[PDB]
């Protein structure tokens, strides 16, 4: 028992955690792109 009840509450939590992960994965990836960006900048700074 309990599975049918908990599956409902847990899946709702799953929706939230999914969206949290999605926001994070795109944001970290964006910051990753920014990392490439700052790298590209520092690639000019490391040059003469």
Curated annotation (Swiss-Prot):
Domain of life: Eukaryota
Reported tissue expression: Detected in brain (at protein level). Widely expressed, with highest levels in brain, heart and placenta.
Cellular compartment(s): Cytoplasm
Coiled-coil regions listed in the entry: 6-43
PTM comment: Ubiquitinated; mediated by SIAH1, SIAH2 or RNF19A and leading to its subsequent proteasomal degradation. In the absence of proteasomal degradation, ubiquitinated SNCAIP accumulates in cytoplasmic inclusion bodies. Isoform 2 is subject to limited ubiquitination that does not lead to proteasomal degradation.
Miscellaneous notes: Constructs encoding portions of SNCA and SNCAIP co-transfected in mammalian cells promote cytosolic inclusions resembling the Lewy bodies of Parkinson disease. Coexpression of SNCA, SNCAIP, and PRKN result in the formation of Lewy body-like. ubiquitin-positive cytosolic inclusions. SNCAIP isoform 2 is particularly aggregation-prone. Familial mutations in PRKN disrupt the ubiquitination of SNCAIP and the formation of the ubiquitin-positive inclusions.
Protein role: Isoform 2 inhibits the ubiquitin ligase activity of SIAH1 and inhibits proteasomal degradation of target proteins. Isoform 2 inhibits autoubiquitination and proteasomal degradation of SIAH1, and thereby increases cellular levels of SIAH. Isoform 2 modulates SNCA monoubiquitination by SIAH1.
Subunit description: Homodimer. Heterodimer of isoform 1 and isoform 2. Interacts with SIAH1, SIAH2, SNCA, RNF19A and PRKN. Isoform 2 has a strong tendency to form aggregates and can sequester isoform 1.
Involvement in disease: Parkinson disease: A complex neurodegenerative disorder characterized by bradykinesia, resting tremor, muscular rigidity and postural instability. Additional features are characteristic postural abnormalities, dysautonomia, dystonic cramps, and dementia. The pathology of Parkinson disease involves the loss of dopaminergic neurons in the substantia nigra and the presence of Lewy bodies (intraneuronal accumulations of aggregated proteins), in surviving neurons in various areas of the brain.
Name of the protein in question: Synphilin-1
Species per Swiss-Prot/TrEMBL record: Homo sapiens
Gene name, Swiss-Prot/TrEMBL: SNCAIP
Stretch of the intact protein here: 512 to 557 of 919
């Amino acid at each position: 028992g309990s599975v049918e009840t908990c599956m409902s509450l847990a899946s709702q939590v799953v929706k939230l955690t999914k969206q949290l992960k999605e926001q994070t994965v795109e944001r970290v990836t964006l910051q990753n792109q920014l990392q490439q960006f700052l790298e590209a900048q520092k690639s000019e700074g490391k040059s003469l």
